[PDB]
Design an enzyme around this catalytic site. Structure first.
Site, PDB file in Angstrom:
ATOM      1  N   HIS A  17      33.016 -12.790  87.017  1.00  0.00           N
ATOM      2  CA  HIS A  17      31.770 -12.134  86.578  1.00  0.00           C
ATOM      3  C   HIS A  17      30.574 -12.981  87.179  1.00  0.00           C
ATOM      4  CE1 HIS A  17      33.678  -9.471  83.213  1.00  0.00           C
ATOM      5  NE2 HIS A  17      34.067  -9.356  84.405  1.00  0.00           N
ATOM      6  N   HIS A  20      45.298  -9.995  86.433  1.00  0.00           N
ATOM      7  CA  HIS A  20      45.867  -9.169  85.422  1.00  0.00           C
ATOM      8  C   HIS A  20      47.183  -9.375  84.790  1.00  0.00           C
ATOM      9  CE1 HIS A  20      42.300  -5.833  85.034  1.00  0.00           C
ATOM     10  NE2 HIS A  20      41.962  -7.150  85.005  1.00  0.00           N
TER      11      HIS A  20
END
Ligand code: HEM
Ligand SMILES: *[C@@H]1O[C@H](CO)[C@@H](O[C@@H]2O[C@H](CO)[C@@H](O)[C@H](O)[C@H]2NC(C)=O)[C@H](O)[C@H]1NC(C)=O
Ligand SMILES: [Ca+2]
Ligand SMILES: [Ca+2]
Length: 336
Positions: A48, A176
């Site tokens: 991010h 992930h």
């Protein structure tokens, strides 16, 4: 030659302070060099922070974002209000303190804590680490973070603007494999995205391809899809990307080799760490990063399921010969 105050040997004098922040982070932030929630939150943070970068905004005469400039810490007050930055406050504040206490730039620190966190998780490659990003940043423009309910075309376009090809988007998603969710469906807090949330391995790719059979919680959450066995959460963007024709063959190629997956992830991450920077202006300090313990387990289709349960989506390449397990279906415990 350059030996640092602690006796270690490095390539350059600018690397010596990083042996100190390495001790702080391992002892404190990672609670005894563990692979738990702190590593997971830092991997959402590095993404991010670096992805707030848009050539298209720059070209339209607007500020486009500084990329991997640590603006998520410096301007936490505006960035943590963004939809995708929930549940990061506690982690952002603990990093801010190591930053101020050691005198390093926030942008470098986020990249360093990512390579160090990953070395605590078995199977991880050694990420490259570069130092010298300036500590000054402007707040990232809003809306530059892909969301879990976005269509594949929306995710590829945003990622393509930042500079990634469809294959690199798939490569970046290997993170992930060390993941859970806390705010998509709070009823199943820390539900793992693959069966080994503490092992950097191929299982995430195999298991998102599996037929969605199970609703893991009392209801479905934001952008939640049926998963293949109790305790596992499946995010709509991961289900869609495994199946879309533009990304399905790269996704499939990631299922059988942890070596190839690690090699490709390390390359995409080195590219992400320098968004908004000139690599050639940074100093390489990769030798400060320790090795992770090796992962010796082979890829498997878990709990009795077989290739008949995976929804093959690459029309060209046949599905890899992956081992099966004579299990009953697993129930996954929350990631630690
Ligand atoms: C295609 C874009 C992606 C989307 C839409 C996406 C979305 C998400 C969402 C919604 C969560 C759940 C957060 C929560 O509720 O706790 C999550 C978790 C996670 N994501 Fe992604 N992700 C993407 C790419 C990546 C990338 C590139 C990285 C970093 C290299 C990353 C690392 C992680 C990690 C490690 C977690 C687990 C956090 C935890 O267990 O606390 N993600 N992601
Ligand atoms: C990087 O810039 C930030 C400001 O954006 C500096 O952070 C402040 O540091 C002082 C003490 O040094 C703290 O008391 C403030 O609370 C900090 N503010 C924020 C927003 O965190 C930081 O020191 C700078 N780092 C370097 C190496 O220059
Ligand atoms: Ca940033
Ligand atoms: Ca895993």
């Amino acid at each position: 030659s350059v030996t640092c105050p602690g006796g270690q040997s490095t390539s350059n004098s600018q690397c010596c302070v990083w042996f100190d922040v390495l001790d702080d982070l391992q002892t404190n932030f990672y609670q005894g060099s563990k692979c738990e929630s702190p590593v997971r939150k830092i991997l959402r943070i590095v993404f991010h922070d670096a992805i707030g970068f848009s050539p298209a905004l720059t070209a339209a005469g607007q500020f486009g974002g500084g990329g991997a400039d640590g603006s998520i810490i410096a301007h936490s007050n505006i960035e943590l209000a963004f939809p995708a930055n929930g549940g990061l406050t506690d982690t952002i504040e603990a990093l801010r303190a190591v930053g101020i206490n050691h005198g390093v730039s926030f942008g470098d620190l986020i990249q360093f804590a990512t390579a160090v966190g990953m070395s605590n998780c078995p199977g991880s490659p050694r990420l490259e680490f570069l130092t010298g990003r300036s500590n000054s940043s402007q707040p990232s423009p809003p809306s530059l973070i892909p969301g879990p309910g976005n269509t594949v075309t929306a995710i590829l376009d945003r990622m393509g603007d930042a500079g990634f090809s469809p294959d690199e988007v798939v490569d970046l998603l290997a993170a992930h494999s060390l993941a859970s969710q806390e705010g998509l469906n709070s009823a199943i807090f820390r539900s793992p995205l693959d069966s080994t949330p503490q092992v950097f391995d191929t299982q995430f790719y195999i298991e998102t391809l599996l037929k969605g059979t199970t609703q893991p919680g009392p209801s479905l959450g934001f952008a939640e899809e049926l998963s293949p066995f109790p305790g596992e959460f499946r995010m709509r963007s991961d289900a869609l990307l495994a199946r879309d024709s533009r990304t399905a063959c790269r996704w499939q190629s990631m299922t059988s080799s942890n070596e190839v997956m690690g090699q490709r992830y390390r390359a995409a991450m080195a590219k992400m760490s320098v968004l908004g920077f000139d690599r050639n202006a940074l100093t390489d300090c990769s030798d400060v990063i320790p090795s992770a313990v090796s992962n010796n387990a082979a890829p498997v289709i878990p709990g009795g399921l077989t290739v008949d349960d995976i929804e093959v989506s690459c029309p060209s390449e046949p599905f890899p010969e992956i081992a099966t397990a004579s299990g009953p279906l697993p129930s996954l415990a929350p990631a630690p």
